[PDB]
Design an enzyme around this catalytic site. Structure first.
Site, PDB file in Angstrom:
ATOM      1  N   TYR B  38       6.319   4.099   3.476  1.00  0.00           N
ATOM      2  CA  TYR B  38       7.129   3.965   2.268  1.00  0.00           C
ATOM      3  C   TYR B  38       7.802   2.603   2.124  1.00  0.00           C
ATOM      4  O   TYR B  38       8.272   2.252   1.037  1.00  0.00           O
ATOM      5  CB  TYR B  38       8.188   5.068   2.214  1.00  0.00           C
ATOM      6  N   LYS B  93      -7.351  30.791  -5.631  1.00  0.00           N
ATOM      7  CA  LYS B  93      -8.586  30.034  -5.813  1.00  0.00           C
ATOM      8  C   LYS B  93      -8.550  28.720  -5.046  1.00  0.00           C
ATOM      9  O   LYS B  93      -9.561  28.301  -4.470  1.00  0.00           O
ATOM     10  CB  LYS B  93      -8.833  29.777  -7.299  1.00  0.00           C
ATOM     11  N   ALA B 194     -22.179  37.801 -23.800  1.00  0.00           N
ATOM     12  CA  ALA B 194     -22.137  36.342 -23.704  1.00  0.00           C
ATOM     13  C   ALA B 194     -20.682  35.899 -23.581  1.00  0.00           C
ATOM     14  O   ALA B 194     -20.009  35.561 -24.558  1.00  0.00           O
ATOM     15  CB  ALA B 194     -22.815  35.703 -24.910  1.00  0.00           C
ATOM     16  N   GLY B 195     -20.192  35.903 -22.343  1.00  0.00           N
ATOM     17  CA  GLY B 195     -18.817  35.542 -22.064  1.00  0.00           C
ATOM     18  C   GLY B 195     -18.641  34.109 -21.609  1.00  0.00           C
ATOM     19  O   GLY B 195     -19.430  33.231 -21.975  1.00  0.00           O
ATOM     20  N   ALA B 196     -17.602  33.859 -20.809  1.00  0.00           N
ATOM     21  CA  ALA B 196     -17.309  32.497 -20.372  1.00  0.00           C
ATOM     22  C   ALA B 196     -18.364  31.984 -19.400  1.00  0.00           C
ATOM     23  O   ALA B 196     -18.879  30.870 -19.555  1.00  0.00           O
ATOM     24  CB  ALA B 196     -15.919  32.438 -19.740  1.00  0.00           C
ATOM     25  N   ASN B 319     -17.682  31.726  -5.283  1.00  0.00           N
ATOM     26  CA  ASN B 319     -17.456  30.311  -5.531  1.00  0.00           C
ATOM     27  C   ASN B 319     -17.725  29.550  -4.240  1.00  0.00           C
ATOM     28  O   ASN B 319     -18.324  28.470  -4.259  1.00  0.00           O
ATOM     29  CB  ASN B 319     -16.032  30.078  -6.028  1.00  0.00           C
TER      30      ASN B 319
HETATM   31  N1  LIG Z   1     -18.472  35.158  -9.651  1.00  0.00           N
HETATM   32  C1  LIG Z   1     -18.102  36.360 -10.101  1.00  0.00           C
HETATM   33  O1  LIG Z   1     -18.222  37.401  -9.480  1.00  0.00           O
HETATM   34  C2  LIG Z   1     -17.500  36.382 -11.477  1.00  0.00           C
HETATM   35  C3  LIG Z   1     -16.955  35.214 -11.997  1.00  0.00           C
HETATM   36  C4  LIG Z   1     -16.401  35.227 -13.264  1.00  0.00           C
HETATM   37  C5  LIG Z   1     -16.404  36.399 -13.981  1.00  0.00           C
HETATM   38  N2  LIG Z   1     -16.933  37.517 -13.466  1.00  0.00           N
HETATM   39  C6  LIG Z   1     -16.895  38.751 -14.311  1.00  0.00           C
HETATM   40  O2  LIG Z   1     -17.206  38.461 -15.619  1.00  0.00           O
HETATM   41  C7  LIG Z   1     -16.351  39.203 -16.524  1.00  0.00           C
HETATM   42  C8  LIG Z   1     -15.525  38.204 -17.332  1.00  0.00           C
HETATM   43  O3  LIG Z   1     -15.608  36.896 -16.837  1.00  0.00           O
HETATM   44  P1  LIG Z   1     -15.468  35.569 -17.806  1.00  0.00           P
HETATM   45  O4  LIG Z   1     -14.048  35.100 -17.805  1.00  0.00           O
HETATM   46  O5  LIG Z   1     -16.599  34.681 -17.411  1.00  0.00           O
HETATM   47  O6  LIG Z   1     -15.712  36.208 -19.300  1.00  0.00           O
HETATM   48  P2  LIG Z   1     -14.584  36.650 -20.417  1.00  0.00           P
HETATM   49  O7  LIG Z   1     -14.094  35.355 -20.990  1.00  0.00           O
HETATM   50  O8  LIG Z   1     -13.635  37.669 -19.876  1.00  0.00           O
HETATM   51  O9  LIG Z   1     -15.493  37.441 -21.526  1.00  0.00           O
HETATM   52  C9  LIG Z   1     -16.143  38.657 -21.218  1.00  0.00           C
HETATM   53  C10 LIG Z   1     -17.041  38.980 -22.407  1.00  0.00           C
HETATM   54  O10 LIG Z   1     -17.592  40.292 -22.298  1.00  0.00           O
HETATM   55  C11 LIG Z   1     -17.712  40.891 -23.563  1.00  0.00           C
HETATM   56  N3  LIG Z   1     -17.390  42.313 -23.575  1.00  0.00           N
HETATM   57  C12 LIG Z   1     -16.201  42.962 -23.364  1.00  0.00           C
HETATM   58  N4  LIG Z   1     -16.289  44.256 -23.469  1.00  0.00           N
HETATM   59  C13 LIG Z   1     -17.605  44.485 -23.776  1.00  0.00           C
HETATM   60  C14 LIG Z   1     -18.346  45.656 -24.020  1.00  0.00           C
HETATM   61  N5  LIG Z   1     -17.804  46.875 -23.984  1.00  0.00           N
HETATM   62  N6  LIG Z   1     -19.648  45.530 -24.299  1.00  0.00           N
HETATM   63  C15 LIG Z   1     -20.187  44.314 -24.337  1.00  0.00           C
HETATM   64  N7  LIG Z   1     -19.599  43.150 -24.127  1.00  0.00           N
HETATM   65  C16 LIG Z   1     -18.303  43.291 -23.849  1.00  0.00           C
HETATM   66  C17 LIG Z   1     -16.860  40.091 -24.554  1.00  0.00           C
HETATM   67  O11 LIG Z   1     -17.669  39.531 -25.537  1.00  0.00           O
HETATM   68  P3  LIG Z   1     -17.029  39.595 -27.148  1.00  0.00           P
HETATM   69  O12 LIG Z   1     -16.012  38.461 -27.179  1.00  0.00           O
HETATM   70  O13 LIG Z   1     -18.241  39.386 -28.042  1.00  0.00           O
HETATM   71  O14 LIG Z   1     -16.447  40.997 -27.140  1.00  0.00           O
HETATM   72  C18 LIG Z   1     -16.270  38.924 -23.738  1.00  0.00           C
HETATM   73  O15 LIG Z   1     -16.391  37.710 -24.420  1.00  0.00           O
HETATM   74  C19 LIG Z   1     -15.547  40.145 -15.642  1.00  0.00           C
HETATM   75  O16 LIG Z   1     -16.290  41.324 -15.482  1.00  0.00           O
HETATM   76  C20 LIG Z   1     -15.492  39.367 -14.323  1.00  0.00           C
HETATM   77  O17 LIG Z   1     -15.296  40.131 -13.176  1.00  0.00           O
HETATM   78  C21 LIG Z   1     -17.474  37.529 -12.243  1.00  0.00           C
HETATM   79 MG   LIG Z   2     -11.202  31.657 -12.143  1.00  0.00          MG
END
Ligand SMILES: NC(=O)c1ccc[n+]([C@@H]2O[C@H](COP(=O)([O-])OP(=O)(O)OC[C@H]3O[C@@H](n4cnc5c(N)ncnc54)[C@H](OP(=O)(O)O)[C@@H]3O)[C@@H](O)[C@H]2O)c1
Ligand SMILES: [Mg+2]
Ligand SMILES: NC(=O)c1ccc[n+]([C@@H]2O[C@H](COP(=O)([O-])OP(=O)(O)OC[C@H]3O[C@@H](n4cnc5c(N)ncnc54)[C@H](OP(=O)(O)O)[C@@H]3O)[C@@H](O)[C@H]2O)c1
Ligand SMILES: [Mg+2]
Lengths: 758, 758
Positions: B38, B93, B194-196, B319
């Protein structure tokens, strides 16, 4: 300036980049721990934080974590080099936060240099940090940016020096007015160079109960007074005196009383100081060059109260004075910001300390503290074991008084106890040793004068002025090795060379060695051969005769090859029939010393008691209170082996000899080092806290434990092996001793030779 | 769910808040070191950084440092709880970044939630970090924000899962197409939700050489195909098939080949899988509930290639699979960003690993790896010693291939050497032991069944299903202690209780004890009194008879009080005439084992050789390659004490018995632990790297060293003291053993009883 330019260019980044290493303070060596930290198991702390934001400082950082958030626009004293480019001195400022108070510093550096988007980015990064340490925001956008930033976050927004040294500066003012038995009501002031840390300081200085009309602000452009410029300067016209034709600084004194100024080059002169009233209080805070040349002004006028910011002289204003300790008061109280009562009650603590400094385990020998309140002592020295436990509780107390905190501290007895416990585990006893050695260098023999490590250590000792080296070896080989190494030391000029062959004192040396060892198996021819082929014998005879004051050997060969010579020549100390080597470690519990790692293979009860007493005396001389624990595989009589019985006998003997020494045993290492285990086992133990001296049953256990802990659990090198019980100052080192170890041990030998080297 | 809700609510924050502790990786225990960090001395690294920005990653963090920069809008699986409020799972994380690859994570959390100011703040904080780990940016602003952010910084801008698992997912695709001897050219796909992390995955999946027309994207609103909605959805119309009247998902199969989907609840059915073509490749990645219930679908149709993201089944997508190792490829190569070749060459490494996994010091016993490439093995298991040294060099190689890096790696032999060296120092051998114990629980006696620690451990073992406990004590006291403690275990239901008094088998127990000890000083009345007042004798007789498989004693009394009973009842192992206790430590050099800390006070050469061989065998069974070093105060013959001669004799005996064992000695602890010191001393040493087994001359040295290192230099508890050389599985613990220690040692005893408990 390579002795500083190159040396500082040699930066301790080689093992792992960056002084900070974001690392788990929690165990992460099992799938259970990993799942607790990143898998379901870490969702719970986050969810609990989200439910009520009261848990932000609790489950994470942001409790102890400040972020010195910067745009790299005034990097300490560098300037606008950049956010990322400021990383060296950024980390340098962040490292004297954890080092001295244990403040976590995320050195995140804002790349946005605009005076209005910088605040936006900092407020964006607010939730990451529980108090920002805004630094390197330059003038005049430092005041502007800090003024903008103070009003947004609900967590302590405490700038650096702008808020900064005002605490130390106003504490120094409060003590200086005490020194000259004056009062704040009638004191007059002169300010020069209204810079980043200057123009904001009188604002606090007013808060003590000071009238604004007594302050005269100035800058490079003459004097900032009301009537000088048609457009009155902001934050300075309140103090601005009426127009009186005073256009030169040499006359605006008119018998003033303070020279608070944080600026660059000199503005004050000797006749200017003469024009000052009785008992001048010059406070030139310029770091590059003092604004008054204190020796010259003191020769011009006596009873000066000159205060500077450099550590070469007493009353130094560093950040370590209160900045880590302000946040130790700011963050550790839960404040949402830092008021002016925060900034003023910490003024009443460090100012109190200077005239209330005493005891605190003064280094019995070494050190040479010699600190008494007066004209040459206004505020405590930069580094102090209670510069924390007085300033941080002052800031916390001011927090509760201002009623702005969110986690008010409970009964302060517990707070002071924890703060003192943290104090015990962070000590820098080597700095007083270096300071005391430098003011009285002695002649030290280095029998292994042709070693590269010894030559580097000789260069360091010549540079720091710690010793007058006396190298032993072939002058030719020494000189060629010096030239190859790149050192700037020369024979006679910096260090004396004693040639092992063709020594003019050969006849008188081997004669004395023979008279010492004639009836110990050494003939006259063997004495002659030893004073040509054994540099340790030459150095020992030199020290015994009086041509040198200390010896530092052991960098070659075996330890006992040198220790036998040392013991044969010098003998044992008066009243002492044994010798022991003490090795120092910096453990998580603090500085720890292991006794007799090198000399006695299997000491008995009397030898163990003598070693314990000598180790306690040596640790006391370091300034550390000795807390001895005799170690064994048995926990308080669990085993009846002769080793444990010997340890108990040694404990009884030590208790007989030194009733005042805090010692207990025999116990386990964990019982000695952590107090909870000991309290569970022996609730009535005479040992409080962690033991800093560990006395071991045999040399095998001591050496194995020290070797394993040094490479596993240790921060840095201080001293070791410290040889105790020999008549004259001499330390046998090891062949793997580093240059830093040699320099530290030579400084210790020099200081021990200042204390009757016999 | 308190067994998980409360247990995870019990978060390891108690000692110091926050899993990360920004701490000096460099020594800071001397004024020299503090001034280097420092004071003038830290200005030099910063000035050198400013002169040329090439030194940013070198002198500081930002080399290994990512910042998981977040607005707390999708916190792993939580959502938009907030930046500061996301701190629990934020740190969760960030902790599986340092734990598994040594990635520094500054958990700075952006408070700006707008999709256009968030990027501004992140780019403002760019110079602080050498690669951002953008996570918790929610959909659809995750794709938008990442697309904006990728184009600004000149340092690796690598989002989380959005870029993310595509590497693992496309690697799994590459291996699955290998499994069913198909080709990427003609494969058809079905995507749901079709999510994130879903809609961005087929984009990589295309990059393998895949035609866009083969992908069918779907969401909650039916099927996203060209002709469905008048306004064609972006990033999905390229794959969108022509309109054909297919409005229900149950028919859009038409014999597809892939079900890549990262979404929520189930969408696929069994008849849907039947409509699939030959060799279906369902890849349901839903974490809460699998989209197909793999057991049900596998009963419906064989040869399934079902892939999930949960660790309960093989082929898990975490991850830790590549994220810490991507940045170990991204940051450690000097890239300015991560291209799609980065994202695709790391696909060719983890996919290669699954069909090229072998050797790597398989746990000789324990563990039960049993991993062969096939329909149930597509990608490696979450945690692997070469999941790093294959994926990270893949990312770096892709960096040089893309020509985007700034610090290209030299000859990969050195890189692989350093990476493997880092691999040795981070091992989690206890997870295979827990997994192997869980699939075959055994009956374990806990003679101290009334202890609170033993009761907590019993609750944990019942919950994890590791053992069938057999507590010994008064049922009344046990039950009241259970009720007071708050546990949810019941007698008979979860754990069997053996009453020390009024035991129905009392007559047959003391009779056997007497027949064992009749000529060893024990009378019939003493045998009767021992089977009522000595729970260790009861447990040992139980195990010897066959009513239990293992014993875990020692939580009360002295170690040898229990070890004498254990040795008297069970005896020694066949071909073994000595016993030793091995204690494990997690040092900076890795998992370290200290041999015979408890049993033999002063072993001789033959006993030391036997202890060394048993310790090496036990460490081999853990899955760690044994690297033995016999320790002494003498460094390779420096001293001629009987202890060092005994160590050399033991070394010769061990070399005779086990020529394949890597062992050397006798040496110092630092020579054993750091290779540079040993190479300086013995360049030809048979010991490579750091020694993980330290055999000590006597029990005092071993115990003192272990006790000091455990409290000073140690991360967490794994095992110890592991008793070796006794006929039957039994481990004598210490009275200060924690609940975690008891659980781990019971699991180890259970696994050892699965291997002929005699
Ligand atoms: N490495 C891993 O194990 C891992 C990592 C990340 C996430 N995940 C899993 O992925 C999911 C969310 O993660 P994320 O943050 O990536 O996505 P997210 O942003 O939570 O979005 C999930 C999507 O699923 C759809 N959804 C919800 N309810 C539904 C239904 N009943 N039928 C059909 N589609 C439906 C929605 O689409 P709409 O907007 O069109 O409703 C939503 O956009 C969780 O299950 C999580 O555990 C797993
Ligand atoms: Mg995360
Ligand atoms: N704790 C410490 O020891 C400590 C801490 C911080 C700073 N400092 C010292 O303070 C100085 C700068 O620190 P800072 O960043 O706070 O301020 P700064 O932003 O560098 O500004 C220094 C000011 O000094 C003035 N100045 C320059 N040359 C001058 C001259 N020849 N005559 C009169 N005034 C002159 C300038 O005023 P104009 O703009 O009107 O020219 C300038 O604004 C350095 O000497 C530094 O070592 C010491
Ligand atoms: Mg600064």
């Amino acid at each position: 300036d390579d002795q500083l330019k190159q040396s500082a260019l040699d930066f301790h980044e080689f093992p792992v980049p960056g002084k900070i290493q974001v690392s788990p303070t929690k165990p992460l060596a099992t799938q259970r721990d990993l799942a607790l930290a990143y898998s379901p198991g870490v969702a719970a702390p986050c969810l609990e934080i989200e439910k009520d934001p009261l848990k932000a400082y609790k489950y994470t950082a942001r409790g102890n974590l400040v972020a010195v958030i910067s745009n790299g626009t005034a990097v300490l004293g560098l300037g606008n080099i950049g956010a990322l480019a400021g990383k060296p001195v950024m980390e340098g400022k962040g490292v004297l936060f954890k080092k001295f108070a244990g403040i976590d510093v995320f050195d995140i550096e804002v790349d946005e240099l605009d005076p209005d988007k910088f605040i936006e980015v900092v407020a964006a990064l607010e939730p990451t940090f529980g108090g920002i340490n805004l630094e390197d925001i330059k003038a005049p956008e430092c005041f502007y940016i800090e003024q903008k930033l103070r009003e947004r976050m609900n967590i302590p927004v405490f700038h650096d020096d702008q808020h900064g040294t005002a605490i130390i500066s106003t504490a120094a003012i409060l003590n200086g007015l005490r020194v000259v038995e004056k009062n704040i009501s009638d004191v007059r002031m002169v300010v020069s160079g209204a810079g980043a840390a200057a123009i904001a300081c009188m604002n606090l200085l007013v808060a003590l109960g000071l009238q604004k009309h007594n302050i005269v602000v100035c800058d490079s452009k003459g004097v900032i007074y009301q009537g000088r410029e048609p457009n009155m300067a902001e934050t300075k016209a309140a103090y601005a005196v009426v127009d009186d034709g005073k256009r030169t600084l040499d006359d605006v004194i008119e018998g003033a009383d303070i020279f608070l100024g944080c600026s660059g080059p000199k503005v004050l002169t000797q006749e200017m100081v003469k024009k000052m009233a009785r008992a001048p209080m010059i406070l030139a805070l310029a770091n590059p060059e003092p604004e008054i040349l204190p020796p010259l002004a003191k020769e011009v006028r006596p009873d000066a109260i000159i205060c500077t910011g450099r550590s070469d002289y007493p009353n130094q204003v560093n950040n370590v004075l209160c900045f880590p300790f302000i946040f130790r008061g700011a963050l550790d109280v839960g404040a949402t910001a830092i008021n002016e009562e925060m900034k003023l009650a910490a003024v009443r603590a460090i100012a109190e300390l200077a005239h209330a400094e005493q005891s605190e385990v003064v280094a019995s020998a070494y050190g040479d503290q010699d600190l008494s309140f007066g004209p040459e002592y206004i505020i405590p020295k930069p580094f102090d074991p209670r510069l924390i436990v007085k300033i941080a509780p002052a800031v916390a107390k001011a927090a509760m008084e201002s009623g702005v905190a969110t986690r008010p501290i409970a009964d302060f007895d517990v707070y002071i106890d924890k703060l003192t416990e943290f104090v015990y585990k962070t000590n820098l006893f080597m700095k007083p040793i270096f300071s005391q050695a430098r003011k009285a260098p002695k002649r030290v023999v280095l029998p292994e004068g042709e070693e590269a490590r010894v030559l580097h250590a000789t260069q360091e000792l010549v540079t720091l002025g710690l010793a007058k080296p006396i190298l032993i070896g072939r002058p030719n080989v020494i000189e060629m090795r010096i030239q190859k190494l790149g050192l700037q030391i020369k024979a006679g000029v910096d260090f004396e060379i004693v040639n092992n062959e063709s020594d003019p004192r050969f006849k008188e040396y081997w004669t004395e060695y023979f008279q010492i060892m004639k009836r110990r198996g050494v003939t006259q021819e063997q004495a002659q051969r030893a004073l040509i082929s054994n540099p340790t014998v030459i150095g020992a005879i030199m020290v015994q005769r009086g041509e040198a004051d200390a010896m530092i050997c052991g960098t070659v060969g075996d330890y006992h090859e040198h220790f036998s010579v040392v013991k044969n020549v010098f003998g044992y100390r008066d009243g002492v029939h044994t010798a022991g080597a003490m090795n120092a470690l910096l453990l998580p519990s603090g500085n720890t010393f292991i006794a007799d790692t090198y000399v006695n293979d299997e000491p008995d009860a009397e030898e163990l008691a003598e070693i314990t007493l000598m180790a306690a005396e040596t640790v006391r001389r370091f300034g550390i209170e000795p807390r001895v624990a005799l170690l064994s595989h048995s926990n308080f009589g669990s085993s009846d082996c002769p080793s444990s019985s010997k340890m108990r006998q040694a404990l009884e003997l030590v208790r007989e000899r030194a009733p005042e020494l805090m010692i207990d045993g025999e116990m386990h290492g964990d019982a000695a080092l952590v107090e909870a285990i000991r309290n569970d086992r022996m609730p009535d133990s005479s040992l409080k806290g962690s033991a800093n001296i560990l006395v071991m049953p045999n040399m095998e256990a001591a050496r194995i434990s020290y070797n394993l802990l040094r490479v596993s659990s240790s921060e840095g090198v201080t001293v070791g092996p410290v040889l105790m019980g020999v008549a004259k100052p001499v330390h046998v080192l090891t062949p793997i001793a580093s240059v830093r170890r040699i320099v530290n041990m030579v400084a210790l030998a020099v200081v021990e030779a200042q204390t009757q080297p016999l």
